[PDB]
Amino acid sequence: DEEELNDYKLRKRKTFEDNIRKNRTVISNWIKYAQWEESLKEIQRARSIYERALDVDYRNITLWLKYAEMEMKNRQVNHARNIWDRAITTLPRVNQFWYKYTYMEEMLGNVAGARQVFERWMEWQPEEQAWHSYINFELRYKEVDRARTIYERFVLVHPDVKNWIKYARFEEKHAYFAHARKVYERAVEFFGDEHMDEHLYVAFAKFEENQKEFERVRVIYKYALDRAQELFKNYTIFEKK
Amino acid sequence: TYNRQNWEDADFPILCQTCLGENPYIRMTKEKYGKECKICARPFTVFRWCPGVRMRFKKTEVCQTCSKLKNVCQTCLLDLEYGLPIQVRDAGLSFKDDMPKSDVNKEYYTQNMEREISNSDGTRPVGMLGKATSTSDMLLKLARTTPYYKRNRPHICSFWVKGECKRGEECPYRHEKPTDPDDPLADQNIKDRYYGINDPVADKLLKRASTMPRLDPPEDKTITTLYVGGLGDTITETDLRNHFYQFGEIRTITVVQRQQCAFIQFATRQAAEVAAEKSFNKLIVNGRRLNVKWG
RNA sequence: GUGCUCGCUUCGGCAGCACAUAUACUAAAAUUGGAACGAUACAGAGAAGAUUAGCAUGGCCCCUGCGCAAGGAUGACACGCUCGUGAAGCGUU
């Protein structure tokens, strides 16, 4: 039975090598060969197959994803960390590598120093979901001054009215009312000061109505004097209250 | 379709002291692409010379890339630093390196290592030398110190074996009886000697080295007090204290010239074991050699 | 070995001087591993009916050819990728 299994493995490897040699650029043959080598419990053989496939074409996302998933499905954690470090240093613009690296080093790794590794992604100015996930990760690690610096760099790097509203809500939920008032004042001074966005003023009026109704009425009057229908609705709400 | 092994053309062959001979003035011959490599089958620069007066005209067998890869001689196929087979050195240090056996994979691996060496400084036996920093475990005990010139002896005259050597004393080949053909030491595949697989010389030297307990000690029932003989009055307790200071803290260090024994004991079991292994017929202090045993 | 000595001195030789200075893959072998593809046998000639001309394309497949020519069956070989189930992250409640 061992000789028959060896002949079957030799025939399967010969057909896989012939399919590789017939069409080199077809990566599905590489993926099927690597998964068949991993299914027969040959980790270093599948690692050599994946390294050959990455030498053939390193720009494919799925080769890195499958080779890192094969490293993570076994106990080779440091091999997976090396694979993710190479995938980050070659292809920084693929956010899926960053997301799966952070889920590997946060759930399975459980290392806070990976957040410093995450700061490498903060060199690259990613999309806003990275900033939101880092805000929620710093909240899950119970840090609020670090998250204040994160949201300040988010406002400086990606300035938006929704971003300033999220900064105001995060400063209100972290029990820093003076910092929330200073952030609302800076957003009124900078974000849409002459553009007349009429949405950060509504959030400042809501924060003032949470704080003091006279300042909320003054903010509603200033928003009505600077200006739409939402400003008139906020002025009617301030006059009714 | 444009990949092939490049031809290794270089001067200055890498040889042992024993195969090079004893004369300081050697007359040397070089062919540019004379023969092929005996392992990687590439053409290479073939060096040929006579090492002495009645020697064999030894010549290089393997190419320079294989010899730089395994840090061996080009003729003797033994290690440059120690004069040992590479199976013995791989058993001493690391046996997880390996090499492919099929010819296409061997040529591809040799081309990759040749490109790695040519992209390197030029003369470095890869990271295996980085695994060769730890030494003198047991290989220095059986390593030769004198140049063994008897392997440069000429071949046995086959006409004299059949008793028909008409040259007589003019015949440069040896007119003596050969070795036993029934002996399993006489097989000696060259690829087996290079790859370190079932070499009978390596097995015989491993059996010879395994029968010499130069690091065994441990002849006491959990007692750290060991007696080193051969010290006498030439070696005092100061040399024993200086030897035991590398192991850390020593419980007791003394020397008695009545029995010529140095009593050494440590508070730690590992430090006492290291002191017993270092002094088991391998330590020489103040002109006195010490052999560690129970005391 | 040759030639000569303010030689020793016999007439032979010795001594000294001068010239002449490094061949060989060292085998007439023992060994060792690779094989033409012929005999037999397996074997069986592309293109959705049949009989068929072919040019390519890829490379750990070659042969004939002096070939950057032309042949070798077109030299041979070289097919199957629109919805749910879960998981992770993001924003609202």
Ligand SMILES: [Mg+2]
């Ligand atoms: Mg037809």
Ligand SMILES: [Mg+2]
């Ligand atoms: Mg034609």
Ligand SMILES: [Mg+2]
């Ligand atoms: Mg043709």
Ligand SMILES: [Mg+2]
């Ligand atoms: Mg034709």
Ligand SMILES: [Mg+2]
């Ligand atoms: Mg035709």
Ligand SMILES: [Mg+2]
């Ligand atoms: Mg064709």
Ligand SMILES: [Zn+2]
């Ligand atoms: Zn040598």
Ligand SMILES: [Zn+2]
């Ligand atoms: Zn070689």
Ligand SMILES: [Zn+2]
């Ligand atoms: Zn002879």
